[PDB]
Each structure stands twice: as C-alpha cells, then as structure tokens.
C-alpha cells in the first residue's frame, strides 16, 4: 500500500505536506480553471483567519486557492496554499467561486509516528528532502487524525527515510 507523491513542503518529520500522484489530475484541472478565470475574479476583502479565497503566489505571480493564516499590516496576510502546502505573504486577494471551493485540498499534511523519530535527531533530514524536491517519494498512510493529517511512513526509492535519523 505505497502511493507515489512529491514532498512540496517540509518543516520536519512532524510537519510536512505532499502531493499524491492520485490527486494530480484533479489539481491540474483546478489550476487550469483558475488560470482562465483569474483575470475576471472579483476583489476579496473579508480578510480574517481561516478565510478561504484566492491569493497570489509572490514567486509565481499566479493566483491559487488559499486560506488566511494570519492577518498582518498593510493588507498583507500570511496565507496557506491548500493545494500545495507552503505559505507566503501577499496583498493580492480575489474571490474563489463556490464551484471551485468544493474540491478538497490537493496537498496533504503528514507526519511520522513521533514515537519512532530521532535516534540521533537528524536536522540534516531537511536537507536530504529539499535536495530532492524534483523527485518522487512514496508514502503508506497509516491513518489520518481527526485533523486531516495523515500519520505516515516515508520512502525514497524503497528506502525508509527514518534511516536518516539514525546510523
């Protein structure tokens, strides 16, 4: 029971987000629809935590489904791109059609059993993972907590990455 995915964001073995090779088809179509409607999307002003909408990714310049995580100053907010998993600060918000708000997030928050983490406590694991953003990893979902976060085992080319926390 191992599914292909890609680690898009890493904050540790306790907090990271991936993109299941399964949901890619849906995600692409989402992006397609968002790119064509973008220009004509209305301005978004209800700026408060948890507010769903469409924010502009400073790097891409493209708008994506986002959730306001923290309201800062000068109309700048830290937002979380639900279909990716990374956050950013921006000032560009446009409304998200209800039709396009129905789908589920396309990036899944995961973590490894904390009970099996660190034998040497590897912070170089961050490096090992980031060095391979362009690569395909594998996960076996042990469960999904009431929060939506999967508890998982991480694999790279058949090898369990936890092995990178010990000798």
């Amino acid at each position: 029971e191992l599914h292909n995915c890609v680690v898009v964001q890493f904050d540790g073995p306790m907090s990271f987000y991936v993109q299941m090779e399964s949901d890619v088809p849906a995600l692409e179509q989402m992006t397609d629809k968002l790119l064509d409607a973008e220009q004509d999307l209305p301005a978004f002003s209800d700026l408060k935590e948890g507010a769903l909408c469409v924010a502009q990714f400073p790097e891409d310049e493209v708008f994506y489904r986002a959730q306001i995580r923290k309201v800062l100053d000068d109309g700048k907010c830290e937002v979380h791109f639900i279909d990716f998993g990374n956050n950013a600060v921006t000032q560009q918000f446009r409304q998200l059609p209800e039709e396009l708000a129905k789908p589920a997030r396309y990036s899944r928050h995961c973590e490894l059993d904390a009970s099996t983490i660190s034998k040497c406590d590897a912070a170089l694991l961050q490096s090992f993972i980031d060095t391979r953003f362009s690569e395909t990893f594998q996960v076996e979902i042990l469960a999904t907590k009431g929060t939506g976060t999967h508890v998982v085992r991480l694999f790279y080319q058949s090898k369990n990455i936890s092995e990178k926390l010990q000798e």
Binding site: V6, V8, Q19, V24, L27, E28, M30, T31, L35, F57, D60, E61, V62, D83, Y106
Partner: peptide, 6 residues
C-alpha cells in the same frame, strides 16, 4: 513543478 502556472 506541479499544477503551478502557465
């Protein structure tokens, strides 16, 4: 990349 933008 992945479902990003063009």
């Amino acid at each position: 990349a992945r479902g990003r933008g063009r």
